[PDB]
Design a protein around this ligand. Structure first.
Ligand SMILES: Nc1ncnc2c1ncn2[C@@H]1O[C@H](COP(=O)(O)OP(=O)(O)OP(=O)(O)O)[C@@H](O)[C@H]1O
Lengths: 220, 239, 205, 117, 205, 107, 117
RNA sequence: ACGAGAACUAGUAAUAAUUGUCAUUUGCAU
């Protein structure tokens, strides 16, 4: 409602999750070769490398503006091959996934991006947060495990941060006696048999349990 | 200072002109003693650069939060003033090491002073609980061999600045980085905030030179009761 | 600047259920596996009942702004007129005398009384089970009082006397209205541990 | 002897468990086990009290009595090697082995409690 | 703010069988191994009867939402309403006079009573053994009343004396239809333990 | 560390807490982590004696300070019942120079 | 000790138990022992009061009565040394030994109950 | 004569609130 620019707390104060910030950095992995090596032996004029340059530049200087619209993010430094966006925790993750996919569209799945997102508390000196900072994460973690987990907690109340944090306490200590204890805890919960069964089957497997840890941490 | 790990010792990257990526070498800072002559003679490959970088886990960084309740929180309703400190922690077999040279008497005195210093600190917030150390003197054959070569170039291992009358011939053919080195002083005048050393620039700890220069301990002093010294004397590695 | 230590034992009259763990177990130390009374329980119940003693208005209900001198004793330090707390309530721990007692006579440290619920229009019962600390247990407590203002010692100890006496006629933990958790204080003690203040004229029933 | 801990899943027949075992029928055993787990845990040394040896004797007594009262408890105790391990724990008289039995028994109880009608 | 105490004694007229702990044992303490009457039992029984005395509809029977004045007397704090209980019931403990009396007359504390069922068109018996607290024993109780407001104390104790009468002609415990669980009340004493309220005009039969 | 490992004791306890609103009596719970009872911490202090004639006075002051800390709390929520610490096994040694320290005392 | 254990397996013949002993045949003895248990538990000191000594005397009388009533109970009491043990308990006048006897007899009964028709 | 030196992540609040171990069933056929 106020058009005037507001402070970094203007994104901290979101109540849909912890009151924290998100920062994202991305680099094109195959960009040194692309401007240098380019297309071998037959398209290596000044004209064709020039048009490739213009295409990448216009992508990072218009397409970001359009892609970021539905997101609570302000654009800091973007261009060349550097992507530096800061905003709300959940929003940064969602926008990062959207941008990765939309880039793979525009580069026809030829060029890849590497990116890092971290959770940084409000009112930190931003000079210090900057020096700190795909298909797998989208399909396996966000789409399947996160969705079933969110539905499970939505259906069954009273599963506050206490129950989830006891789940963490059992999980992070990778021991079989802890697996039995987690079985007892899930038995004492009142989730549907499907939810409990899926959680326990995932808990038996290392890759799945790390992914489960990440997903439920995202739930909070 | 130069870091170490369990049994590996490290020196900085010579800013030498290698003619081939220009990417993998840029992300690299330090090259252990085993492969140093290999680096100087092009015997290091890109996959080797990736591997050496991969093995370079020798400590991690952290910010510890703190609050300061000396303020009117003593007196009346008044907010606390949180501040932050930056810290580094080494894994149980890491640390830093020195290289010193001089007469035997000078080194005996240095030993005495170092014994005095191990129970003081070597950092910032010493008095608040950061930065004590225990030291050991070990003679590593390989580092000695590296230090006692003879060549045509020179790798500056410390931070130096040539005196006024030698810089013109010192900078004939060189590759170097300058660093504004600043800071305050301890017990010079009444106000610490009012006293602050004049800024000083010196070559970094990886520069390469053709003609050696000796340095000098330069004053950064003014408006003070005693001289305040800054150090600029090179320790050369000749290959 | 002096500090006065208050010592004694708490004797459980009827079974007590603090039970912060949530089946329905009681809080237990992780070094001895024995029940404890968190000091927050003592401070909160004394706070609440001695507050409800004096004036407690609806506007007073709204903000947890309470009587000036109960606030003085327990500290507010929230808004405006700050007052640093003055009575430090510690936890209470399962005493060694009662440990020897129950070990010798082979008595459990916890009973699991089973309870029922008769819902209406159905009369169908649904059971529950609750752990409760056995009576005759004794817990050892320590209080520390700071003398920030010399002339106010008498009034403050008068009020804490009110607090002890009122607590003896009330409960700790849950199921208080269901019989659970009535306590008594016994073998009290006052002694000056730091400073140059006499504590002979002091008493706590 | 961990096959004795996961025999519980091998004993889900058709549906009743252990032929109709319920954890509710294990309550006296669980109470006694918790009692002496606490008492042993507070103990300093590895050598158990002779009175604690008599306590373990009282454990075997109660186990046999419960096996007599209910048949499902009888099957649970007999086939999972409860009696031999109780005797063995009584034989070594070391604290750590008694805790080992306690962890095994608690794992049994919790895992069984996972499945109930 | 004051608290008015009620003390007295339950006389065991015929057998009493709580048996929450279960051949089919009764509830017993563990510091003396002598039976008790849990306070939850007393409170639930009085609440049920006093509710039934007032109005009780099917929709009211649905989810334990009861008449406003009994709710005030025993507390609900569920329907967005501020109601903590105003009447606290403790447990009852097997009294000293009873212990001495049964010691010097050589009579046990518990009767073991054998019961049978006769199957229809079968005439075959399946026996049962039920253990009950012996008759004529006395337990002592203590209640606590809180005066959240001054102008409902007389009315609330009128309600409580009605409830005590109803209990005097009802059963507390298990199997009360088959001849065990009648009780009586003796030696009611009324004091204001903490506060400045008078306990002279107030009475309970 | 070895004692907690052998007896199988975790290094941190988590206490569940709760708050009571007035005029409402709805409880909002919290979750606060706490270091386990009986844990031991090893510490080192250093005294730089820049004046010979003041070491007695300064260790009297540090004695009185440690005595006060014995009867006080460290960290948060001490009024609510946590943070009470104890000091055992204090030794005072001279590690630089030639000053005697066989008479200075700290409990 | 647990001589009860191997004695109960020594008395399994051909099947009859102590020539047909059943749990219904010891109800009165169990009741009396339980009441003496609770009374003695209520006591503070180890010295047995003369009234509790008279209780032990009447308990001996009741063993003898029941043993005269039925033959199998007589054989059980005779071989399990109940009478010598009671005589020694009366001689000792110590509460702890009486509780130890209580535990022994409870073990006896539990075994007899676990092995039944 | 160390981008130093000063600086308690501190203060307020508990596991609470309503729930009955109950409802039927011959120590019985000689
Ligand atoms: N469109 C472009 N044309 C030419 N050079 C570009 C273009 N975009 C970025 N660059 C170069 O990339 C540099 C950024 O380096 P950065 O460290 O961010 O990644 P990079 O080293 O190019 O990537 P990578 O190591 O993953 O191949 C710029 O300084 C610039 O020289």
């Amino acid at each position: 409602q106020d058009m005037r620019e507001k402070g970094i707390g203007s994104y901290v104060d979101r109540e849909e999750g912890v009151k924290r910030l998100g920062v994202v950095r991305a680099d094109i992995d195959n960009l040194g070769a692309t401007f240098i090596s380019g297309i071998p032996e037959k398209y290596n004029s000044i004209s064709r490398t020039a048009t490739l340059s213009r295409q990448l530049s216009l992508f990072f200087k218009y397409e970001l503006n359009h892609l970021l619209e539905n997101y609570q993010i302000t654009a800091i430094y973007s261009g060349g091959d550097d992507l530096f966006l800061i905003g709300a925790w959940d929003d940064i993750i969602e926008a990062s996934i959207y941008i990765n996919d939309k880039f793979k569209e525009f580069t026809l799945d030829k060029l890849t991006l590497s990116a890092g997102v971290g959770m940084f508390s409000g009112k930190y000196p931003v000079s210090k947060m900057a020096f700190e900072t795909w298909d797998e994460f989208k399909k396996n973690i966000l789409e399947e495990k996160l969705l079933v987990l969110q539905q499970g907690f939505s259906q069954t109340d009273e599963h506050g941060k206490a129950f989830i944090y006891k789940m963490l306490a059992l999980l992070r200590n990778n021991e079989a006696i802890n697996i039995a204890r987690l079985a007892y805890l899930l038995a004492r919960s009142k989730m549907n048999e499907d939810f409990t069964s899926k959680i326990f089957n995932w808990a038996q497997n290392d890759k799945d349990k790390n992914q489960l840890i990440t997903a439920l941490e995202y739930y909070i | 200072t130069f870091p170490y790990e369990n049994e590996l010792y490290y020196l900085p990257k010579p800013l030498i002109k290698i003619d081939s990526n220009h990417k993998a070498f840029k992300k690299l800072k330090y090259v252990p003693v085993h492969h140093y002559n290999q680096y100087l003679n092009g015997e290091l490959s890109a996959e080797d650069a990736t591997d050496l970088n991969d093995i370079f886990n020798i400590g991690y960084f952290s910010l510890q939060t703190k609050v300061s309740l000396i303020a009117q929180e003593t007196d009346s309703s008044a907010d606390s003033e949180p501040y932050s400190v930056g810290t580094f922690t080494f894994e149980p077999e890491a640390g830093l090491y020195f290289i010193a040279k001089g007469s035997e008497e000078t080194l005996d005195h240095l030993n005495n002073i170092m014994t005095a210093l191990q129970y003081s600190g070597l950092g910032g917030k010493r008095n608040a609980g950061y930065g004590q150390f225990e030291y050991e003197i070990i003679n590593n054959q390989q580092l000695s061999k590296l230090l006692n070569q003879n060549g045509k170039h020179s790798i500056l291992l410390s931070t130096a600045m040539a005196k006024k009358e030698e810089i013109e011939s010192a900078l004939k053919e060189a590759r170097y980085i300058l660093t504004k080195r600043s800071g305050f002083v301890q017990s010079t005048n009444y106000s610490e905030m009012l006293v602050k050393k004049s800024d000083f620039y010196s070559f970094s700890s990886g520069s390469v030179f053709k003609n050696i220069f000796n340095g000098d301990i330069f004053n950064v002093g003014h408006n003070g009761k005693h001289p305040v010294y800054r150090y600029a004397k090179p320790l050369w590695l000749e290959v | 600047y002096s500090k006065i230590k208050i010592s004694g034992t708490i004797e459980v009259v009827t079974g007590l259920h603090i039970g912060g763990g949530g089946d329905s177990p009681v809080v237990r130390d992780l070094q001895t596996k024995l029940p404890i009374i968190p000091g927050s329980s003592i401070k909160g119940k004394m706070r609440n009942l001695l507050a409800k003693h004096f004036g407690l208005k609806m506007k007073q209900e709204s903000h947890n702004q309470d009587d000036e001198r109960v606030l003085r004793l327990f500290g507010s330090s929230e808004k405006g007129n700050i007052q640093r707390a003055r009575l430090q309530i510690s936890d209470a721990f399962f005493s060694e005398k009662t440990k020897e007692h129950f070990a010798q006579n082979d008595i459990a440290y916890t009973e699991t009384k089973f309870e029922n619920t008769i819902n209406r229009l159905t009369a169908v019962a649904n059971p529950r089970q609750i752990e409760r600390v056995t009576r005759g247990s004794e817990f050892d407590f320590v209080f520390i009082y700071n003398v920030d203002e010399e002339s106010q010692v008498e009034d403050d100890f008068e009020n804490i006397e009110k607090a002890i006496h009122l607590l003896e006629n009330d409960y700790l933990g849950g199921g208080g209205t269901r019989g659970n958790g009535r306590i008594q204080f016994k073998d009290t003690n006052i002694e000056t541990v730091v400073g140059e203040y006499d504590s002979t004229n002091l008493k706590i029933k | 002897m961990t096959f004795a801990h996961e025999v519980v899943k091998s004993n889900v027949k058709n549906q009743v468990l252990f032929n109709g075992l319920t954890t509710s029928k294990l309550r006296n055993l669980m109470e006694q086990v918790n009692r002496l787990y606490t008492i042993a845990f507070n103990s300093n040394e590895d050598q158990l009290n002779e009175e604690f040896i008599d306590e373990l004797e009282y454990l075997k007594i109660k186990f046999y009595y419960e096996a007599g009262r209910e048949k499902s408890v009888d099957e649970f105790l007999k086939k999972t090697l409860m009696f031999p391990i109780i005797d063995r724990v009584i034989k070594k008289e070391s604290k750590k082995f008694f805790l080992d039995y306690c962890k095994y028994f608690e794992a049994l109880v919790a895992y069984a409690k996972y499945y109930q009608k």
